[PDB]
Design a protein around this ligand. Structure first.
Ligand code: GNP
Ligand code: MG
Length: 165
């Protein structure tokens, strides 16, 4: 069986927790229940008729992750950097995450840049075009999700797994 580790990154408002909660438990909250500690969640997939065990890590801040990373996260096979399509400050802050991540981990890890909250399209404040160009130029693939409406999520994780394989 394959065993993979994936870590979730991005600013508060973005929906890291909502992404992995929806995926692993099919649950969602409108309340922002802020993530005080590293948490992990699991998912058994099947790809090429082979069982894939997936541990998904959800993080409690840039500073904590930054101090913990070199000790506790150097064996990560993928990383999902999330931003909120309705929040410009959050997408621009992804650059910070990409660099810091790569300044700590190999390039062997598969990066995803995730524009979450596509149920709020009417409030879009981030150009698809700009985000896609950014993803492409750091070797990340780009993805759109809604955790609230459960769209993009199963595909995001499956593709990340195919990639990590
Ligand atoms: N409309 C909408 N809201 C979403 C979506 N995903 C998350 N949210 C909302 O965004 C807020 C924060 O979500 P949350 O998962 O807690 O964010 P987080 O990235 O874990 N924050 P923290 O870093 O503080 O733990 C909540 O009000 C949550 O319901 C989405 O797809 N659509
Ligand atoms: Mg959280």
């Amino acid at each position: 069986a394959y065993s993979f580790k994936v870590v979730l990154l991005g600013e508060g408002c973005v929906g890291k927790t909502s992404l992995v909660l929806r995926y692993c438990e099919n649950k969602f909250n409108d309340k922002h229940i802020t993530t005080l500690q590293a948490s992990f969640l699991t998912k058994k997939l099947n790809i090429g008729g082979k069982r894939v065990n997936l541990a998904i890590w959800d993080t409690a801040g840039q500073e904590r992750f930054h101090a913990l990373g070199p000790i506790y996260y150097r064996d990560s096979n993928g990383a999902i950097l999330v931003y909120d399509i309705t929040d410009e400050d959050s997408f621009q802050k992804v650059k910070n995450w990409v660099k810091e991540l790569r300044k700590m981990l190999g390039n062997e890890i598969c990066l995803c840049i995730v524009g979450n909250k596509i149920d709020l399209e009417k409030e879009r404040h981030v150009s698809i075009q700009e985000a896609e160009s950014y993803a492409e130029s750091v070797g990340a693939k780009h993805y759109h999700t809604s955790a609230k409406q459960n769209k993009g999520i199963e595909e995001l994780f499956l593709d990340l797994c195919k990639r990590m394989i």
